[PDB]
Amino acid sequence: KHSSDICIVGAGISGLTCASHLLDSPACRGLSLRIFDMQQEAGGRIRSKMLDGKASIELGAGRYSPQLHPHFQSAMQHYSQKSEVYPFTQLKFKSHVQQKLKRAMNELSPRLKEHGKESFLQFVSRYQGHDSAVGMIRSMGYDALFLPDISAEMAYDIVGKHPEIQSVTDNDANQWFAAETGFAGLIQGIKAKVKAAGARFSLGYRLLSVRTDGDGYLLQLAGDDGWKLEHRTRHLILAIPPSAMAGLNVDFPEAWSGARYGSLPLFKGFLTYGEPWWLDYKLDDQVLIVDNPLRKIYFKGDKYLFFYTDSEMANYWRGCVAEGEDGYLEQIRTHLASALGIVRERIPQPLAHVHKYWAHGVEFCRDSDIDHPSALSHRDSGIIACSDAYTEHCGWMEGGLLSAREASRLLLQRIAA
């Protein structure tokens, strides 16, 4: 038999937290747990790396707030991961536009119906012209704020939940932390605890289809070396994001919820140097938000710098990387010089660098349904779906922990019934 009592497809933080809750319940004594992930390492969009062997960098999720993410903070403490303060919470190098509109976003506050749920750009186009509104939105360095299906209501929550811009709203007392060893240390601790409790991991296998087979389910998987594999299970959680769900044969989203779902790409690029040349400019631990394509530039201590972009600007950088390392590094240097107000020859070339493009970096519900529960259920088959996108914290690890707790509750009802 290649079978299991419970199967979790997905070994990001959502899936591994489902596993951890299930194995804690005495109702799962003796039941067997199999965890699939198409990747070769657990973590999903949590991916920590040593750059040049020197320092530790976050290619995916990198920061959290005690105010916004208390379940995440508790997870870090439960698994004894040490946090460090996250420095990039203020813009010391502000602009007239960035100054102007902290004051300007209080005014438009009456958006219940007067502005409602328009686009954020359509909204702000009201207070001042369309031109002025573009420059205001651009100065916050998250290009997703320009998209039409990003409502003005959404946008205000987006802006107050991000550390670089949170001072423009009344979320300016939120505190922020990063992992010292990287969030992968947390992924590793959960994984080890779930393995020691007897769950078995099959990493490197991609789920392709699932069919209901009697009381349980039949899964078709493809290993990344081509090996085709079938698995029977009695209970199934799909701890994968909406974009992955749509690729299956399970009638997503219609058989699952009222809502439609969307996603933004993200891009991060990291560079290290022979000397921490930015210390002369008093830039260590500062973040610059610029209109040029780097958009958000970060100087981490004396160790490295990086930049972070989304939507069309993430696709720009990913395209320019496809045309080869050389023009990519040269474009970066130009835009670094422009952001500092110096000539490109004062920017050294880097020793090492690494980048990462996430085609579906953030996945979110456009709130079409009236209510939206934390985990999902197939109306017919009883498959449970689990993802940060189904919660009040879409786009955050905290949403993963919250979806997983509901997801494991729903599955514990399936055993008790």
Ligand X SMILES: Cc1cc2nc3c(=O)[nH]c(=O)nc-3n(C[C@H](O)[C@H](O)[C@H](O)COP(=O)(O)OP(=O)(O)OC[C@H]3O[C@@H](n4cnc5c(N)ncnc54)[C@H](O)[C@@H]3O)c2cc1C
Of 114, 157, 275, 323, the one binding its own copies by CB under 8 A = 323
Q: Which residues bind Mg ion (CB under 5 A)?
A: 10, 12, 14-15, 239
**Distance (Å, whole) CA 387 – CA 263:** 13
Site for ligand X in 340-359 (CB under 6 A): 358
Residue type, 274: G
Is 1 a binding residue for its own copies by CB under 8 A? The answer is: yes
Is 322 a binding residue for its own copies by CB under 8 A? The answer is: yes
In the list its own copies, ligand D0Q, Mg ion, none, the entry touching 142 (Cβ below 5 to 8 angstroms by class) is ligand D0Q
Q: How far is the CB of 308 from ligand X (least distance, A)?
A: 7
If the CB atoms of residues 93 and 316 are measured against its own copies, the closer one turns out to be: 316
Both tokens of 3, joined, read: 């079978």
Both tokens of 354, joined, read: 């690494």
Both tokens of 180, joined, read: 């010292």
Q: How many CA atoms lie within 13 A of 255 on its CB side?
A: 15
Q: How far is the CB of 318 from its own copies (least distance, A)?
A: 5
In the list Mg ion, its own copies, ligand D0Q, none, the entry touching 15 (Cβ below 5 to 8 angstroms by class) is Mg ion
185 labeled binding residue: no
* Residues binding its own copies: number (CB under 8 A): 20
If the CB atoms of residues 234 and 355 are measured against its own copies, the closer one turns out to be: 355
Of 198, 258, 319, 373, the one binding its own copies by CB under 8 A = 319
Q: Which residues bind ligand D0Q (CB under 6 A)?
A: 63, 142, 144, 158, 162, 264, 310, 362, 395-396
Three-state secondary-structure class, residue 38: coil
Site for its own copies in 340-359 (CB under 8 A): 356-359
> Are 183 and 189 a contacting pair, CB within 8 Å?
no
Backbone torsions φ then ψ of 64, nearest 5 degrees: -150, 160
DSSP assignment of 286-349 = -EEE-SSTT-EEEEETTTEEEEEEEHHHHHHHHHHHHT-HHHHHHHHHHHHHHHHTS-GGGSPP
Site for ligand X in 368-387 (CB under 6 A): 387
Is 318 a binding residue for its own copies by CB under 8 A? The answer is: yes
Q: How far is the CB of 264 from ligand D0Q (least distance, A)?
A: 6
Of 10, 141, 160, 185, the one binding ligand X by CB under 6 A = 10
Closest CA to 95 of 136, 125, 155, 126: 136
Three-state secondary-structure class, residue 77: helix
All residues at 6 or more sequence positions from 116 whose CB lies less than 8 Å from its CB, including other chains: 152, 153
Three-state secondary-structure class, residue 387: coil
Beta bridge partners of residue 211, listed in sequence order: 218
Is 26 a binding residue for its own copies by CB under 8 A? The answer is: no
- Count Cβ atoms within 10 A of the Cβ of residue 80 and give its class: 0-12 exposed, 13-18 middle, 19 or more buried: exposed
Is 324 a binding residue for its own copies by CB under 8 A? The answer is: yes
Q: How far is the CB of 45 from ligand X (least distance, A)?
A: 3
DSSP assignment of 121-143 = HHHHHHHS-HHHHHHHHHTT--G
In the list its own copies, ligand D0Q, ligand X, none, the entry touching 400 (Cβ below 5 to 8 angstroms by class) is ligand X
Which residue ranges make up the annotated binding site? 12, 14-15, 37, 45, 63, 162, 207, 239, 308, 397
Q: Which residues bind ligand X (CB under 6 A)?
A: 9-15, 36-39, 44-46, 60-64, 206-207, 239-241, 244, 266, 268, 358, 361, 387-388, 395-400
Which residue ranges make up the annotated binding site for substrate? 63, 162, 308
